[model samples]
Target: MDYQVPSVALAARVLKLLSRHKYRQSTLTEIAERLGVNKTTCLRVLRTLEREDFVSYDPQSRRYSLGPYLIPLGARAADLNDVYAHALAELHQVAAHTGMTAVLVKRLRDDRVIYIGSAEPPGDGVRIAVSVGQQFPVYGAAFGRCFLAYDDESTWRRVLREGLKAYTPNSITDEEEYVRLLQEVREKGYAVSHGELWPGISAVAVPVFNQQNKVDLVLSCLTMTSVIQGEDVERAVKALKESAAKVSAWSGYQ
Candidate 1:
């Protein structure tokens, strides 16, 4: 049988590591430690990266840093920035109307949630801390719950098997309770998490269904707990659902 290597997965991990620390330099051993791979494998990967001009090495410090090759690649991907550009206008509209920060988050391959779009209206007290591309665990944020709520039973079981890590005092470390809460989120059509990912940052989220009525994206608004509680909380739930409707429509959902 012909021998095959998992170069594609290794390449993606190396690229992600490099992109994550574009401004910083790291040695092969350091990179290996970060990636939990063997140093030898990391060295081979680094050599390939160096050959491709995606990275450069310093003989003195024996460190590697991003090279110029990724520039053109970035330029190409930059054109796709409009993936949700028009939807940003709607986010801005929500922010302006409610004086709250509106955000568009998408699911990652690992079920993680990443903020892909955002809009901040004129505000002074409340502010957005999480920026675009920031990663949130699948069960760690309201944004994540929005995506997690509509998943199939097997998906839920898989995630629950992973067990919540107790990111905060309120984190769901128990598997059974977590599964129950997920079911409730499914029935609720949205999720509201209070500091599940971070302390003092309250979130209200709604699922954005695609044309097939599958939850594809999640729209969320983050504000202080005092702001999203009581009657005002209900208003926020309605507004978030409305924003998600707009996003679903933009995505060709009914």
Candidate 2:
């Protein structure tokens, strides 16, 4: 696969699962079972992870845990919040006008797009909020696809190999079909999804480019199925693209 793991990918996923559960003391056997890998393979990968300072093993407890290397990287990411703060403000205005929830997201974990900021529509009596730092898989999601469509071909292929997790009936479960949608998104410069991530919620997404015209983040509007009937979606798409462009420009896109 052009984008899937050689050996490090499985190692990374095991580390991530450990981090998520704070499993700083999981046995190699336990982890291997959890990761569905053989004990010998898991032990080898864990040893590599330990060498890379991404994991540590305790001989006394016979367990593995996340290590120290992630700290400095997270610190750098924390300091960069200013980039998305401006986008969040602009998205809030659009959210208020359209009565649709909006989010600003940044790429993470190779190709996954994680929400950085989210704003709920005002006075709409609808409550929709995506978690900040929550990762949307780079498959079957408008948010992820919008961000990925503008990415280099290598990234597109990588995401394809990660597997398009079928979240719902609308999810593009076929790799070839998903690739076609990616090409479509690149040409249209936006992405739309219905019943993929969540049934009855339709999402529209556009990329925000940096000063160098590199895709920086994604701006999105998620609406209930009923609100986006017919021409309403066209108008919403226009407004969304316009707002995304404005955010990108204000962020120093020349």
**CA shift at 138, candidate 2, in angstroms?**
2.3
Which parts of model 2 are misplaced by more than 4 Å?
A: 1-83
Q: Candidate 2 lDDT, tens digit per residue, 1-254?
A: 78877587887678667764445579987888877888898888889889989888888988888888877766675577655676777788878777788888787765566788888877745477778878766654887787777778887787677777788888888888888888999899888888788888988888888767777688888888755777766766787788888877656564
lDDT values of the candidates?
A: 0.76, 0.78
Best of the candidates, lDDT: 2
Error of model 2, residue 79, in angstroms:
12
Regions more than 4 Å wrong, model 1: 1-83, 123-126, 226-229
Screening candidate 1 with a backbone cut-off below 3 angstroms (N, C-alpha, C), the clashing residue pairs are: none
